[PDB]
Enzyme design. Structure first.
Site, PDB file in Angstrom:
ATOM      1  N   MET A 153     -48.257  12.397  25.500  1.00  0.00           N
ATOM      2  CA  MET A 153     -47.572  11.087  25.488  1.00  0.00           C
ATOM      3  C   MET A 153     -47.209  10.544  26.880  1.00  0.00           C
ATOM      4  O   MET A 153     -46.190   9.868  27.048  1.00  0.00           O
ATOM      5  CB  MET A 153     -46.329  11.144  24.580  1.00  0.00           C
ATOM      6  CG  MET A 153     -46.633  11.537  23.147  1.00  0.00           C
ATOM      7  SD  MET A 153     -47.671  10.301  22.349  1.00  0.00           S
ATOM      8  CE  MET A 153     -46.467   9.018  21.993  1.00  0.00           C
ATOM      9  N   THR A 165     -44.719   8.131  28.348  1.00  0.00           N
ATOM     10  CA  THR A 165     -44.904   6.684  28.040  1.00  0.00           C
ATOM     11  C   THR A 165     -44.366   5.851  29.183  1.00  0.00           C
ATOM     12  O   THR A 165     -43.245   6.064  29.640  1.00  0.00           O
ATOM     13  CB  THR A 165     -44.194   6.257  26.736  1.00  0.00           C
ATOM     14  OG1 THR A 165     -44.801   6.921  25.619  1.00  0.00           O
ATOM     15  CG2 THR A 165     -44.268   4.721  26.525  1.00  0.00           C
ATOM     16  N   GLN A 166     -45.187   4.915  29.647  1.00  0.00           N
ATOM     17  CA  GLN A 166     -44.767   3.936  30.629  1.00  0.00           C
ATOM     18  C   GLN A 166     -45.356   2.585  30.227  1.00  0.00           C
ATOM     19  O   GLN A 166     -45.760   2.378  29.078  1.00  0.00           O
ATOM     20  CB  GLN A 166     -45.196   4.328  32.069  1.00  0.00           C
ATOM     21  CG  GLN A 166     -45.695   5.746  32.305  1.00  0.00           C
ATOM     22  CD  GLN A 166     -47.174   5.873  32.015  1.00  0.00           C
ATOM     23  OE1 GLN A 166     -47.608   5.642  30.883  1.00  0.00           O
ATOM     24  NE2 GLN A 166     -47.960   6.227  33.042  1.00  0.00           N
TER      25      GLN A 166
END
Ligand SMILES: *C[C@@](C)(O)[C@](*)(O)[C@H](Cc1ccccc1)NC(=O)[C@H](Cc1ccc(OC)cc1)NC(=O)[C@H](C)NC(=O)CN1CCOCC1
Ligand SMILES: *C[C@@](C)(O)[C@](*)(O)[C@H](Cc1ccccc1)NC(=O)[C@H](Cc1ccc(OC)cc1)NC(=O)[C@H](C)NC(=O)CN1CCOCC1
Ligand SMILES: *C[C@@](C)(O)[C@](*)(O)[C@H](Cc1ccccc1)NC(=O)[C@H](Cc1ccc(OC)cc1)NC(=O)[C@H](C)NC(=O)CN1CCOCC1
Ligand SMILES: [Mg+2]
Ligand SMILES: [Mg+2]
Ligand SMILES: [Mg+2]
Ligand SMILES: [Mg+2]
Lengths: 250, 196, 222, 204, 233, 226, 196, 233
Positions: E107, E1-2
């Site tokens: 993710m 996730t970013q």
């Protein structure tokens, strides 16, 4: 800088009279004659435009007032008192009715609200009664056409035809002879014009007479097309020209 | 921080302010933010001081090993090594790096590597918190193929303004000049640059 | 924060007859209030006289279908080209879905074909692999609109024989393929009227002993 | 927690040829617990019918409120309120509680006694009017009712046909909803007779 | 996730009778700052495919390198690499779709929306979309970001269904694309005037146009608009 | 919702779609989003449905009373001023987004107003979920010196873009034309491009299909005489 | 938004871009952000469109009532009325307003009222999201007592750059010129200002 | 409850033998932006008191107006307003302390730290602090913000206790104040070079110095510092 008059200025005297109401009715007697006649397919209300100066533009003083698109009022007595009552009657028709039910009130109920306002001026602290009698003519879907008188007390009565002010005794008698339950609206207008000539001293034309009707729906006065169930105001103020046309066959 | 690198006729010049902040406290007022990764490949550092050091030390190591095996690396190659580190570790780093170098073949080059780890080759670049205040100034006053003295003045005036308006920039203005002639370190003190 | 799920809308519908089954789906694909496509097929011939749709989050749906198709291919290789029966497909699909029990495929799955006696079969799944054989199922966004209509018109629920006071149910009949396609077309027109994510086109896959046939119909594009 | 689905319930109304129908279920629960099997959701003020779904305390309160208001209307106007006027009154009354609303889905049904025109209307909890020619649905199985009505309905049905259509719409929608059912009532309304019928339905 | 940092806005595209058109502006935004003004977001692969990319530019540059390496690898031990075993639009797309969905499933998405436009061996037009979720779809018109909301309605007036594609010429399609780009410059706060456009035709091959500008803009009516309501002067 | 306003030579035209939604469900397929404030001041409504209806009815009521009080025909800027002050006071919680238009003694006018109380002037405007689809059409086809016929075409085209491309909008197109010197013409269901096709089957049941437990006559009448 | 007001020899000029945003969507591309509160007292608006309108309408009302009773208000007085509203309602407002006016006595004046409701009298002022990018440019290029044509050019070049770099600014550049001569409204389209 | 927007940094001050000195820089910061460069934060009240204010500038301008109105009001029906019934530093302080504490008690503080410096009627030095919480204290040296951390240690080397005040001249005290202001310019990221300084003496009255600059700065050692560790060139 405070209103310390929280007591009634209208009270009962030993004889049982409410003096301020009687005195208000006396102010109404001094007022210019106005009248209303109910026909089968309409109502007419009428009065004299007694101008104060001839430099006055009597067009700018409207004695006959639209309250709703199907209801109109005229008065006799103190004109300023009438003007503020018209403002409040217009408003109460929205606040106590149209904003609740989405439709304009029936005549008797709007009359009832004006009556209330006038009764409150007869009992509340620090006020005098209104020095006017109103004639309110109107139409609504379930009652048809109607004509009501409202007095300084707040009392109202429905009439077939009546008159108030200066020459009302004579005018009421004139109307008792001419009124019948088969009158068409034009016949009622003609009778209204005849009755009103008796009470006017001076000039008698479309510029000195103010006359309005509650009659047929006027779709040309609505301002928009496209909604079938909106057919237009039943209230119409007759023009100077329209009145004069009916005075030539008089 | 306020940092910039500007290509010109004879090469490229790097410029930086000298302020390191710890909140509103100035931890170091004479910081050296211009760091050598190869003889004629230098970088300007902005963002986390720890992150940009760690990255610059690794790049210096990679390029020294490149040199031993394959000879002198290009400026593009140096930028590629910075990018790889910044891109792959984007979740854990706060590093905005400008890479500048001089080849004889390619002359002066400038690559900027912002937060996400993208690379952008440009005629000049600006970065750091203080750079926001000089985008307008720098766009209006930059020309290609300026002289050394013109480029020194362009950077001095630009970082002057960044320093004036940004509280996170200040101190001295340091510059590194990269040409065929070699490597020239310049310094400019507040009493010169403020009155511009 | 990154959200790994999306909602691509659409609706699907499976009905089984005596010697056939249908699987229908609309051809609209959406995200939020945009139309991505008016014709993106959602119902697939998987081999061995099995049709499949996995409606909801289209990426998960496509992954699931892709894996089941591949499952059929390897079933042939490993068991001497044997035909995968619909009951065996269903169980296999349960294991595919339950494999991702703690990071689910965000879909409602329906398969249709013929059982091992030639009778029409519809099997229906939840997102983590629970399943049931039924005469009848709708899945996806407009499932709540369509299922009760199918309960009424396919299984004759709440319908009694006239004049029996209320003590003899309407007896269950299989429906002809012509009668089923009528219920499908009406089901989807009704759903298109009232559900914003349903529209554009309807694609019906019909399965008989002779194979898989397709029909297509326009739906409202608003 | 969500007040529109604590108690459960549904109302549907349909127009036919010179008639209207309005129907409701009888359940009142506290989430999973069914409490009462006799909780009717349809009321009348003269010849105007009001169905109310949602939070049951607000259903009761609004019935008592509209009984109050229509009683006074009748005394002052000297006639029964018509459905078009009552619809406006419902809307006004709901919108005056805009920021602390009654958690309800009202439905009006009736025949204008002057024009003979069949009339139905629905509202959201803050008074937006949905005046529909075909049907109005409300409650916890509203999705299910929309689906049944949209497929089953056809215009100009006769009273005894409309009865079958509305009853099948209600019964089958209720059976796909955990919080609706437990009995049902169907009012068939013509200009001067109103038949009320309790349906046999599944008691789960 | 970013979270995406440097970003590209819309990519718009459509089919016409003999091919496909795709366009995207040349901006790399940094939040509200219009940071980089010469960014190419249309990336050709061979002479039969253009991959148009929106979203995170660092991830775009990663995808650019994946594609460049895919061409290198397809040439290995392949004497028909410039002929029957050249990379197709469908091969390039499926590769990217595979990667996007794998990355979302771990993710750690590539924060992009991608349109692969091209022409297959048999002359068929190819136009398909994939994004950070691995969601894929095809349509006669396709657009990412603001383009989906404003370009698609305009482009669909030209090609509303499959049957409209043979009726649509390259002149009509390019005009619709160029008009759509102007509308986006009017209305998208993270757009630019400068853009690139590419046509992949089954007869004339790949035409790649750089440094286009939005032109013929209506601003003139602005001088008559005064205040927000009652202000006359 | 898709709502638009387009200025033309001698007036202004407003248009709207006719869909209302509750979540992803279509609550009403033929709502009226064109609200009359006064006879020649109309507005198109988007946002929370009850709020738009209540806000236009209140301001329309007060505009009528103001018109009677002043003996003047109401102005669009008064409708706008009252709407903005009301909406601003409620800090966005009354979710009405309106395109306000009309003709009055001052001329023809076109405004937009947002829920928080900001207003705009324009020659062409769009609001609601379909405003981007509509604005794309308006930005491509609008010109100055439009005729009445060209403006109705443009406005309904802009709504159609919303109807087809936005899931929030659908069904029909309503128009109202306000021309200087003339009555406002309200064109209810001006376009009807989404009539439901004939159903395949009738679902009319055999009488007696539904099981009944009890019947009774309901007393609707008043209390009787004798 | 990008807004500025600049005093010069003959008076003061106000300038603004024309972009109104709703997230990344441009709600209005030909917005008029320069609003009249008195004959020769004008303001530039930035922040919430609703808040700044509500404030400006109240100020216009206060100054019209001032005029009836006490004659023409000074520019300082107008700024004081803006400040009172912004300061006392600081919890509920997002308004950055520049007030500019012309008296015959005081000539051109500029007051800026940022978020907190402080007042600052300045020779020129800049505000809005786009102003960050031109602090450097404006500081370097502003002189006092410029001519009208010089001031028009200074503002045109300044807002040009703000528009170039800020995505929340764009469209046309509007200006209002305030001198003894009267009130002059100017407009400048993208095709003129972009190529500068 | 709010948050400060435009802010002023340290105010520093000390007592010396015959009076008090107070100083503050001329900056109004806007977060990290050094927005306004000519802000006076020393506000004289009569000829015997200077109120030095840090923190929110909008609230400072409010306090400025409260003080101006206090002078106006004290003159009313007061023939000794320029003599025995003139406002004292202690009267001005108690008024401000009362207000600050009332405002914190209604959860709507004036977001400031305030030093009231002056000389009383009897020649006594007055120096007292009050802030947004209504906390009050007095000391031979007082400073707000960064000044408390860096100025006080320097100023306390000169006046470490009450007994050191008669030993300290105006020349020594001013030099310490001017030196402290340089140290703050070196080390506080929200400080400026330009500042104002005021002396309130029992003999010479109020001297108010504007447009002072920090001067005689050591930066020269900077040219010898290279890299962060191992970098030699
Ligand atoms: C504008 C400025 C001065 O900030 C510029 O970018 C500096 C670049 C620089 C400084 C020294 C050597 C080389 C280059 N950066 C700093 O001064 C940084 C600012 C900064 C801190 C933290 C983060 O975190 C995402 C980004 C930027 N200062 C520091 O890094 C100092 C030495 N360390 C800290 O403040 C401790 N931090 C605080 C936050 O949590 C991580 C540890
Ligand atoms: C395209 C659309 C549907 O959004 C357009 O704006 C409609 C405009 C309109 C105007 C006048 C009459 C009818 C329709 N709006 C609607 O249909 C709204 C959409 C909407 C739902 C929810 C919210 O929530 C903030 C905003 C807008 N629909 C409604 O208002 C429906 C009838 N009622 C509800 O959804 C329940 N409301 C929602 C708002 O909070 C109170 C309860
Ligand atoms: C840079 C820019 C364009 O933002 C500049 O400041 C504009 C000034 C302006 C615009 C129109 C007329 C006069 C002056 N401002 C806007 O365009 C604002 C931006 C903004 C929105 C919200 C807030 O909230 C604290 C601050 C600035 N745009 C709007 O106000 C638009 C019309 N309304 C909305 O976006 C709805 N908002 C969203 C946030 O919550 C409140 C309602
Ligand atoms: Mg649909
Ligand atoms: Mg049930
Ligand atoms: Mg049960
Ligand atoms: Mg811009």
């Amino acid at each position: 800088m405070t209103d310390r008059y929280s007591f009634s200025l209208t009270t009962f005297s030993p004889s049982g009279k409410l003096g301020q109401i009687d005195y208000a009715l006396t102010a109404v007697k001094q007022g210019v004659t106005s009248l209303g006649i109910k026909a089968t397919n309409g109502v007419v209300i009428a009065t004299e435009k007694k101008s104060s100066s001839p430099l006055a533009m009597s067009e700018t003083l409207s004695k006959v007032s639209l309250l709703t698109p199907d209801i109109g009022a005229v008065y006799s007595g103190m004109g300023p008192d009438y003007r503020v009552l018209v403002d409040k009657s217009r408003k109460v028709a929205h606040t106590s009715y149209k904003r609740i039910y989405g439709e304009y009130p029936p005549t008797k109920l709007l009359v009832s609200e004006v009556a209330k306002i006038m009764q409150e001026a007869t009992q509340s602290g620090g006020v005098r009664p209104f020095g006017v009698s109103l004639l309110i003519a109107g139409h609504d879907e379930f009652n048809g056409f109607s004509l009501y008188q409202v007095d300084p007390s707040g009392s109202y009565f429905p009439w077939k035809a009546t008159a108030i002010g200066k020459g009302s005794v004579a005018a009421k008698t004139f109307l008792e002879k001419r009124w019948n339950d088969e009158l068409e609206l034009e016949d009622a207008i003609h009778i209204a014009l005849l009755t009103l000539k008796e009470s006017v001293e001076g000039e008698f034309n479309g510029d000195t007479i103010e006359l309005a009707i509650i009659g047929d729906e006027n779709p040309d006065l609505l301002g928009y097309t496209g909604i079938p169930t909106d057919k237009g105001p039943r209230f119409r103020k007759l023009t100077s020209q329209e009145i004069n046309d009916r005075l030539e066959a008089l | 921080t306020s940092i910039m690198a500007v290509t010109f006729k004879d090469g490229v010049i790097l410029g930086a302010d000298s302020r390191t902040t710890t909140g509103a406290y100035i931890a170091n007022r004479v910081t050296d933010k211009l760091t050598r990764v190869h003889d004629k490949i230098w970088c300007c550092r902005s963002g986390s001081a720890a992150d940009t050091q760690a990255i610059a030390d690794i790049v210096q190591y990679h390029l020294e090993l490149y040199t031993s095996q394959y000879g002198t690396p290009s400026t593009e190659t140096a930028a590629s090594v910075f990018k790889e580190l910044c891109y792959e570790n984007k979740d854990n780093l706060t590093a905005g790096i400008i890479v500048a170098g001089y080849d004889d073949k390619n002359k002066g080059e400038v690559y900027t590597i912002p937060l996400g780890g993208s690379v952008h080759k440009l005629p000049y670049a600006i970065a750091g918190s203080g750079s926001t205040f000089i985008y307008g100034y720098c766009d209006k006053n930059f020309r290609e193929n300026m002289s050394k003295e013109e480029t020194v003045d362009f950077i001095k005036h630009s970082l002057s303004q960044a320093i004036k308006w940004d509280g996170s920039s200040g101190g001295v203005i340091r510059m590194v000049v990269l040409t065929a002639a070699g490597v020239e370190r310049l310094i400019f003190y507040p009493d010169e640059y403020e009155q511009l | 924060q990154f959200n790994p799920y999306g909602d691509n809308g659409g609706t699907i519908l499976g009905i089984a007859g005596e010697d056939f089954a249908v699987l229908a789906g609309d051809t609209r694909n959406i995200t939020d209030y945009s139309i991505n496509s008016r014709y993106e097929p959602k119902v697939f011939d998987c081999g061995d006289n099995i049709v499949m749709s996995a409606n909801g989050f289209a990426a998960d749906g496509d992954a699931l279908v892709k894996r089941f198709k591949n499952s059929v291919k390897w079933y042939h290789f490993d068991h001497n080209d044997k035909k995968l029966s619909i009951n065996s497909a269903a169980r296999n699909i349960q294991h595919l879905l339950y494999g991702k029990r703690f990071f689910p495929y965000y879909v409602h799955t329906i398969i249709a074909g013929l059982d091992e006696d030639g009778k029409g079969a519809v099997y229906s799944f939840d997102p983590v692999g629970s399943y049931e054989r039924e005469q009848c199922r709708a899945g996806g966004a407009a499932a709540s609109l369509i299922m009760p209509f199918l309960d009424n018109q396919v299984n004759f629920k709440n319908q009694y024989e006239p004049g029996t006071n209320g003590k003899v149910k309407k007896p269950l009949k299989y429906l002809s393929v012509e009668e089923v396609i009528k219920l499908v077309r009406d089901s989807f027109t009704s759903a298109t009227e009232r559900h914003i994510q349903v529209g554009d086109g309807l694609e019906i896959l019909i399965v008989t002993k002779d194979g898989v046939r397709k029909e297509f119909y326009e739906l409202k594009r608003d | 927690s969500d007040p529109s689905s604590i108690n459960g319930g549904i109302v549907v109304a349909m127009t036919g040829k010179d008639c209207v129908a309005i129907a409701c279920d009888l359940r009142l629960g506290s989430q999973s617990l069914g409490v009462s099997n006799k909780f009717e959701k349809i009321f009348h003020y003269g010849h105007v019918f009001l169905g109310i779904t949602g939070l049951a305390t607000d259903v009761t309160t609004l019935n008592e409120m509209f009984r109050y208001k229509t009683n006074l209307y009748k005394l002052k106007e000297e006639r029964a309120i018509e459905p078009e006027t009552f619809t406006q009154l419902v809307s006004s009354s709901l919108y005056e509680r805009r920021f602390g609303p009654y958690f309800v889905g009202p439905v009006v049904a009736g025949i204008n006694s002057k024009s003979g025109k069949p009339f139905i209307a629905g509202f959201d909890l803050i008074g937006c009017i949905d005046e529909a020619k075909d049907f109005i649905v409300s409650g916890t199985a509203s999705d299910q009712l929309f689906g049944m009505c949209e497929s089953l309905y056809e215009p100009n049905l006769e009273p005894e046909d409309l009865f079958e259509t509305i009853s099948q719409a209600l019964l089958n929608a209720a059976d796909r909803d955990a919080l609706s059912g437990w009995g049902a009532v169907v009012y068939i309304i013509k200009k001067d007779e109103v038949v009320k019928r309790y349906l046999k339905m599944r008691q789960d | 996730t970013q979270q995406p940092i440097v970003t590209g806005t819309s990519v718009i595209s459509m089919k016409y009778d003999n091919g496909v058109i795709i366009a995207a502006d040349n901006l790399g935004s940094y939040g509200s700052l219009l940071r980089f003004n010469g960014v190419e977001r249309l990336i050709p692969v061979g002479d039969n495919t253009v991959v148009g990319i929106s979203g995170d530019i660092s991830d775009m540059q990663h995808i650019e390198r994946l594609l460049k390496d895919l061409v290198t690898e397809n040439a290995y031990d392949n004497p028909l690499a410039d002929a029957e075993e050249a990379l197709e639009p469908s091969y390039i797309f499926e590769y990217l779709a595979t990667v996007m969905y794998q990355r979302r499933s771990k993710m750690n998405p590539l924060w992009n929306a991608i349109i692969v436009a091209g022409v297959q061996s048999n002359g068929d037009q190819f136009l398909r979309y994939v994004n950070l979720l691995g969601v894929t779809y095809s349509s006669p018109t396709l657009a990412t970001g603001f383009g989906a909301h404003m370009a698609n309605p305009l482009l669909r007036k030209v090609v509303d269904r499959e049957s409209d594609i043979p009726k649509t010429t390259v002149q009509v399609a390019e005009e619709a694309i160029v008009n759509a780009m102007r509308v986006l410059y009017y209305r998208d706060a993270r757009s630019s005037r400068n853009f690139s456009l590419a046509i992949i035709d089954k007869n004339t091959g790949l035409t790649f146009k750089k440094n286009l500008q939005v032109e013929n803009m209506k601003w003139d009516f602005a001088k008559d608009i005064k205040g927000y309501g009652t202000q006359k002067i | 919702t898709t709502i638009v306003g387009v200025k033309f030579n001698n007036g202004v035209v407003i248009a709207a779609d006719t869909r209302s939604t509750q979540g992803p469900i279509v609550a009403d397929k033929n709502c009226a989003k064109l609200h009359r404030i006064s006879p020649k001041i109309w507005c198109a409504a988007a946002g929370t449905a009850a709020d738009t209806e209540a806000v236009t009815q209140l301001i329309g009521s007060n505009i009528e009373l103001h018109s009677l009080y002043t003996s003047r025909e109401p102005r669009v800027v008064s409708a706008l001023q009252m709407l903005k002050q009301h909406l601003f006071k409620y800090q966005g919680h009354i979710g009405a987004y309106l395109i306000v238009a009309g003709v009055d003694p001052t001329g023809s006018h076109l405004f937009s107003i947002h829920a928080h109380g900001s207003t705009d002037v324009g020659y062409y405007l769009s609001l609601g979920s379909g405003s981007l689809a509509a604005m794309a059409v308006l930005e491509s086809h609008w010109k100055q010196d439009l005729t009445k016929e060209e403006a109705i075409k443009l406005a309904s085209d802009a709504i159609q873009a919303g109807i087809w491309n936005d899931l929030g909008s659908g069904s029909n197109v309503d128009v109202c034309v306000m021309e200087i010197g003339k009555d406002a013409e309200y064109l209810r269901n001006y376009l009807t491009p989404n009539v439901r096709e004939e159903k395949q089957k009738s679902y009319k049941f055999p009488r007696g299909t539904t099981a009944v437990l009890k019947e009774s006559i309901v007393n609707i009448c008043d209390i009787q005489e004798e």
